Amino acid sequence: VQGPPSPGYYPSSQITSLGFDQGYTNLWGPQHQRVDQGSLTIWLDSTSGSGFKSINRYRSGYFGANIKLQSGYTAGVITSFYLSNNQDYPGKHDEIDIEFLGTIPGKPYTLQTNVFIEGSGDREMRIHLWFDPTQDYHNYAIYWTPSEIIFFVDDVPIRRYPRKSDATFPLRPLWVYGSVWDASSWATENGKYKADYRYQPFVGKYEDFKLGSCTVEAASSCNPASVSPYGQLSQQQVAAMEWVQKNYMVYNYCDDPTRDHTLTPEC
Numbered sequence: 001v002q003g004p005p006s007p008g009y010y011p012s013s014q015i016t017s018l019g020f021d022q023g024y025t026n027l028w029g030p031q032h033q034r035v036d037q038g039s040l041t042i043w044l045d046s047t048s049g050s051g052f053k054s055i056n057r058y059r060s061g062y063f064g065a066n067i068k069l070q071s072g073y074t075a076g077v078i079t080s081f082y083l084s085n086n087q088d089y090p091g092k093h094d095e096i097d098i099e100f101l102g103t104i105p106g107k108p109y110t111l112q113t114n115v116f117i118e119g120s121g122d123r124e125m126r127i128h129l130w131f132d133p134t135q136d137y138h139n140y141a142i143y144w145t146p147s148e149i150i151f152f153v154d155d156v157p158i159r160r161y162p163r164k165s166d167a168t169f170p171l172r173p174l175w176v177y178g179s180v181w182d183a184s185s186w187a188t189e190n191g192k193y194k195a196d197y198r199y200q201p202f203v204g205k206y207e208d209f210k211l212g213s214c215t216v217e218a219a220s221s222c223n224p225a226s227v228s229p230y231g232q233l234s235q236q237q238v239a240a241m242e243w244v245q246k247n248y249m250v251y252n253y254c255d256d257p258t259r260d261h262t263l264t265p266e267c
Contacts, residue, residue: 001130001131002130002247003130003131004130004156004240004243004244005236005239005240005243006236006240007155007156007157007234007236007237007240008229008234008236008237009155009227009228009229009234009236009237010155011062011141011143011152011155011212011225011226011227011228012064012139012141012152012154012155012210013155014212014225014226015062015064015210015211015212015225016210017066017207017208017209017210018038018208018209018210018211019035019037019038019039019209020035020038020039020040020052020206020207020209021035021038022038022209023054023055023056023176023209023211024040024052024053024054024055024176024178024209025052025053025055026050026051026052026053027051027052027053027177028048028049028050028051029042029048029049029050029051030050031048031050032044032045032048032049032050032180032201033050033052038207039205039206039207040052040205040206040207041203041204041205042178042179042180042203042204042206043180043201043202043203043204044077044180044181044182044200044201044202044203045197045200045201045202046197046200049179049180049181049182050179050180051080051177051178051179051180051181052177052178052179053175053176053177054175054176054177056175056215056216057085057173057174057175057215057216058083058144058173058174058175058176058213058214058215058216059173059214059215059216059218060144060145060146060213060214060223060224061143061144061211061212061213061214061224061225062141062142062143062144062210062211062212062213062224062225062227063081063083063141063142063143063144063176063210063211063213064139064140064141064142064152064209064210064211065081065139065140065141065178065206065207065208065209065210066137066138066139066140066206066207066208067079067081067100067133067137067138067140067204067205067206068133068134068136068137068138068204068205069100069109069133069134069204069205070102070134070202070203070204071134071135072105072199073104073105073196073198073199074102074103074104074109074199074202075102075103075104075184075187075188075193075194075195075196076102076182076183076184076187076188076191076193076194076195076196077102077180077181077182077183077187077195077202078099078100078101078102078179078180078181078182078183078187079099079100079102079179079180079202079204080097080098080099080100080177080178080179080180080181081098081140081142081176081177081178081206082095082096082097082098082099082142082176082177082178083095083096083142083144083170083174083175083176083177084096084116084174084175084177085172085173085174085175087175088173089118089119089172091119092118092119093116093118093119094115094116094117094118094170094172094174095114095115095116095121095170095174096114096115096116096142096144096149096170096174097112097113097114097115097116098111098112098113098140098142098151099111099112099113099114100112100133101126101183101187101188102187102188102202103188103193104188104193108128108129109128109129109133109134110126110127110128110250111126111127111128111129111133111153111158112124112125112126113125113126113151113158113159115149115161115170117167117168117169117170120263122253122259122263122264123161123253123264124251124252124253125159125249125251125252125253126249126250126251126252127158127244127245127248127249127250128248128250129153129248130247130248131154137205137207137208138153138154139152139153139154139155139208140152140153141155141210143224143225143227144170144174144224145223145224146163146171147162147163148160148161148162148163149161149170150227150233152227153244156240156241156244157233157237157238157240157241157244158241158244158245159241159245160233160241161266162266164265164266165265165266168264168265168266169266173216178204178206179204180202180203180204182195212224212225213225253267254267
């Protein structure tokens, strides 16, 4: 295993790799978190998962990490990296998600991306990957400006969510989070395979954090990082994103005939 065509531009290579403590602290389950020379390990077992949160609240930016997932049986468990304001607006929040959905032997991990606006999501896109995300660290990133969201895997854009209306786009400040947790009811084949704690702990590893971003109170000149040679995805970037969605996309909410698309007019 064919990988995508080169995107011709490498946003992750233009931003300094950071240790955990330069951007983040633990939020819950500190007993299931360790940091070794900037590299983070968090884990889930029968008693608790763990999650971390950025020190700052942001208005925009480029947010990335190198992440490595657990091999073997991992059904029902989600390893995550996301932007959210759920703690500022409980129940009525915005979120931008990367979620790895655990799996069973013989079947690949699923990477889900999602967007919540004022408390409602249902904006899922799911892909499988062109590499084994348990064998080494791979780069995952969320780019977020007032005009668009772009998700990147190893600097390949896998999805773009443009601003079609204010009501369907995240315009309020977000913090960065990451977690490992039990989503047995839905994560793996819509809940068919659930967490099996015989295989515990379920470990998530994160390092070389990337922040090319703008805090809420940052000087007004602050804007995110270039994500393309131009002011917009290049045709080479677009072609790579197209290949991913052609060859690896397994769900797109816009294409689901069971979904009421009026509830999501950005489609």
